Amino acid sequence: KTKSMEAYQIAVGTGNTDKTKPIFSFQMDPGYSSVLKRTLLGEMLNYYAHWSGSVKLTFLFCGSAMATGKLLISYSPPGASVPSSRKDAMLGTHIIWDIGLQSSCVLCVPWISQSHYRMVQQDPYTSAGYITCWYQTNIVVPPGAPTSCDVLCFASACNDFSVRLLRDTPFMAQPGKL
Amino acid sequence: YTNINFYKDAASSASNRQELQQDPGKFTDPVKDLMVKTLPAL
Amino acid sequence: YTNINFYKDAASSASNRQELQQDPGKFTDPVKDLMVKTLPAL
Amino acid sequence: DRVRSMTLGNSTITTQESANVVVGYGEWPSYLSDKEATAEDQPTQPDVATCRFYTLESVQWEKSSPGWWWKFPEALKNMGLFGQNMHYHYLGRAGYTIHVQCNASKFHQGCLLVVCVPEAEMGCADTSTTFPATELTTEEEPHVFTSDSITGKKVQAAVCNAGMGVGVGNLTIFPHQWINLRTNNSATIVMPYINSVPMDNMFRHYNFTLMIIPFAPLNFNEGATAYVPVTVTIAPMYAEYNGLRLASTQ
Amino acid sequence: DRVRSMTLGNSTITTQESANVVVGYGEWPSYLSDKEATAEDQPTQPDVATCRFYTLESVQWEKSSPGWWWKFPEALKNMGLFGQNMHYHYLGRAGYTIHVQCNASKFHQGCLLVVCVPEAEMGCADTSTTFPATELTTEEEPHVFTSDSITGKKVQAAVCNAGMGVGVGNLTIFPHQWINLRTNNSATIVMPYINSVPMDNMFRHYNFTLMIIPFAPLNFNEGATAYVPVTVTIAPMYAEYNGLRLASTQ
Amino acid sequence: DRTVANTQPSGPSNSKEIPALTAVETGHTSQVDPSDTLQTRHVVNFHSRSESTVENFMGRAACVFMDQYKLNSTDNFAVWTINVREMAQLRRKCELFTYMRFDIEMTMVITSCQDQGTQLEQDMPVLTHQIMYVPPGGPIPAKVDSYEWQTSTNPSVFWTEGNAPARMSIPFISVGNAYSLFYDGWSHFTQDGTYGYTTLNAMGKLFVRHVNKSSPHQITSTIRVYFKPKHIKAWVPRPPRLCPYINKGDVNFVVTEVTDARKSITDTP
Amino acid sequence: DRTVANTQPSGPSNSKEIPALTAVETGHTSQVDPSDTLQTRHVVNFHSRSESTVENFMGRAACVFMDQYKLNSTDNFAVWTINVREMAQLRRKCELFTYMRFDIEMTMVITSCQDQGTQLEQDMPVLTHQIMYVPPGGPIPAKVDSYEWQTSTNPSVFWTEGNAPARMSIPFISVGNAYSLFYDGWSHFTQDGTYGYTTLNAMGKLFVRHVNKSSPHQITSTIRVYFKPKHIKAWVPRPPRLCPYINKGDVNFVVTEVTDARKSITDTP
């Protein structure tokens, strides 16, 4: 799916099976996590070696107007293993999204770090947490409506984001004369 | 020092490395009608 | 001379070699209660 | 007026179709005052850690479902730092906000009654004996009512009497709200602290019981979604604790 | 001036023969200010529950005892609500007061040096390899020095170098006090928070090490008590925690 | 040099305000702050976005050209058409904006080395080099001793080896109001010719040669040119180029992948 | 620049004041002056503690790195991880404090010498060298003619032989509020990984190479780097290291002796 349009589609379903398992999970680290490495924020972050600030993620529900449901999205600060149940994910920074007319909800990571700055490259001393989603309630649709919908996510920086050290991007290489 | 020009030409000057001006409203908020964060979007 | 900076950056400056400030009380006298030399310690 | 947004701690709940929230008896929860206090110690007052939304397990509303009940605050144990403080503290005070979510399309019909009964006492099916404490509270799943008389060392879960020996239709005296699929999909109830003593042990005392009873049966035609989930979310407010000792294993 | 009384939380320590307490570098511990803060959240600040005296295990000072060391703050885990908050919190700040008790009659002689070394780094006996983390910290018993060179995947516990590659007699530069049986029987040291970053993880970082080394050997004649115990009591002060998540099992 | 915004204290709230809820179909980016959805303390931020400016970002030398000329036919001099689409390092940085105005500060580095031969016994004096910029439409030399080398009007620089590298400054010399990096058009009015940005690029050529006439044995030299933009202004930001470059003249590319493959949707390394 | 305290006159005294008597268990250092226990005259002292300051003590260059690269595979360039734990002379001086903030003023000395061979007849022009500092996380060159050498964003210095040694200034580039020389912790949160100060050291690498392509015969060069700290601040003084160093990475040591052996307790040489 890395060479198609399905990479941006987060599938959602209506069923009784596998309702206790995560919808998606990835690392918060913007510098090197494959999920958000190549985004607009990541591309500018790879020209720098230090970063700080807060990041906000919004989700759009691309489904039928008659569908309704709830979702739980949580950020777990680093220091523990990745949560494996919704009881573990409800003890952190979480927000409950009710799908409706607004059709979008915003989650903010409030820059929990020991130092003032972190490093773009992967280092054990400075690392971020994990993002996970869970089913607060199942998705209910009326008869005659599509069973499955899709969700899209957008990432952007806040007004307190900054970068200090300047380096070269690692995404460009020239094997020979053009 | 740092404010003395020894050359008449304007291109023969140091780079402006101490200027900080920003305007993110051009791209973040291009909508014609004002939107309030507290109030519902629609 | 000796007080003119030809470079805008602050790191591009000479070392501060004419500063003399001391505070030996931090280590020599860390006790909470004051002790008088003439008076007995205990 | 349909839209409403509630923010507490690090959690936020958003609704697009709802009614005005109901404050229990018209009094917002608050902290205990010095004149009304009886204890002699410095209370610990966590704010963000122990006062946030906690989403419980969900249930499926089938056509023949008779109802469910939950017995707080014990159901809120072992979740977050709210339960952990309970184990180490002999006394505590708290207030709660209850949000119940149930959604359906425009081709579905049904009605639900959400009511909080303070100091609700349940009688046994066998009048000559008592039931174990497991029947009242399990802390993991909702207990279900029944549409007929049952027997054994269990509570009388008949929907006619609701287990309290009173009419089911007269429960509207207590603070309540209705969930009608045609109109609304979420109900929110704010409840203050109600007890005879200013503080009491949380484990051995059940302050209030949340009961959801479908007065109108769910009905739909072929082709519609048959799995309608019901989810309950509760958030403690103004948590206060007095008395520190070794943890209680229970 | 010999008598002193210290009260913190629900615990109190009384001494009848002692010297004036030593404040580390002349600065009393306090809370972090807004200008020096870097985090963006509401810190939880327990006052009575997590700031009180905690008495560790005691040890016997024999005639041939070379010494002992403790590596806080990990040694303070699993005791009270101070350790419990550590498991659930990624970052924390605290200050400590250390009280060491050792008593003897007028017919006993000996001297002890109590010193807190910030950021003390221990080298391995085998210079070509590293030692497991169990050797540095055990959290239950004090680790003992030795009077001769040792080998293996362990720290060099020789009293001559103290495990840091520096002279044992030059440790007086750090805040310290002496316990002379003829004069005093208790030593108290107050230490502020010292670190490069405003906050750091407690589990993986060892802020300071408490070392007790007998410069003067214990000696006594027949008929005197041969069991002289040494007890250490530490009390956290101005505890602050930022960052809440699931508990860390370690 | 102002700092970033500070954080304001927040508390518990239950009301009809919905900062989190928004609509993304409007085309507006949400302005939610962390204080709006969580309980936060008060902190003073002194961090400054001082190195994120365009002027500081572009303010660093980068290699643009490299060639070799020898001293002992057409190998005695080098010819370069001045373009910034020959090195990938600087091409990617300058393709993030559609139009740009800037003044370059060119510098050159010249090194020489004797060639490996059977006979290497020679004694030579210091070497001198000449660099000439031919304006567009000017005559182009065809030989080392051609008549165009006497720069009556064209600029020239003479640099003896062993001294500091030469440096020069060039102003805005574009016919239009800015440099158009991307041009979506054809050269001719009949929608024919060459499609791309080559049509608008009319910069002149550069010539380098050896001033010394001859040497007993062959000697080869290499020249490297570095550009630093200053007094820069940028317009119309553009997304970064994903695919590696293929040819300098055009923007032809091959199909690539957006991101690196992961094991599963819920896979955390 | 103030002077030290003067001496005050004293006379015979018989009273209950006991300046000499004190208690050393309190942890306080006695402040007794020579006038307190003896009869002294009045002298004016003009001596000043002007060279005992930390800034003046640290204000002197010291060697930090030394390596060789040759001009004729991987021997044509040198790679150095920037650390101050490779030379004992400066390591001992900088281990007397736990935390320190300072700005370095680096300089380099480059020398070249022809290698001894059977055939030595050659004539070569002046030589040029390039030094590039790769920021942490940046691409590292793998060849002399690799593409990373064109420093679009990374700093670089070109120094032709025969001129004055190059010099540069670097500011405080630490993530934290100071440089932690001693770190008592583990890299991972599970108390595993590497124990020592290596975890906090995240400084970038340095690359040196020859600009000239080739020479008829092999030539070798040596580069030496010197550091001078300025605008320095120090905290938490530490006792000096007694035992000689064994490995750069860690602080492992061998058992040594506190002082030199004497014949007896009452032996005066």
Ligand SMILES: CCCCCCCCCCCCCCCC(=O)O
């Ligand atoms: C060698 C001495 C004379 C040198 C004259 C200056 C070199 C001419 C270059 C002018 C164009 C510079 C900017 C062009 C960049 C672009 O084409 O976008």
Ligand SMILES: CCCCCCCCCCCCCCCC(=O)O
């Ligand atoms: C060669 C030109 C570019 C040179 C760039 C400066 C060299 C980088 C060194 C930065 C770190 C200096 C201080 C680090 C000391 C330490 O690690 O404690």
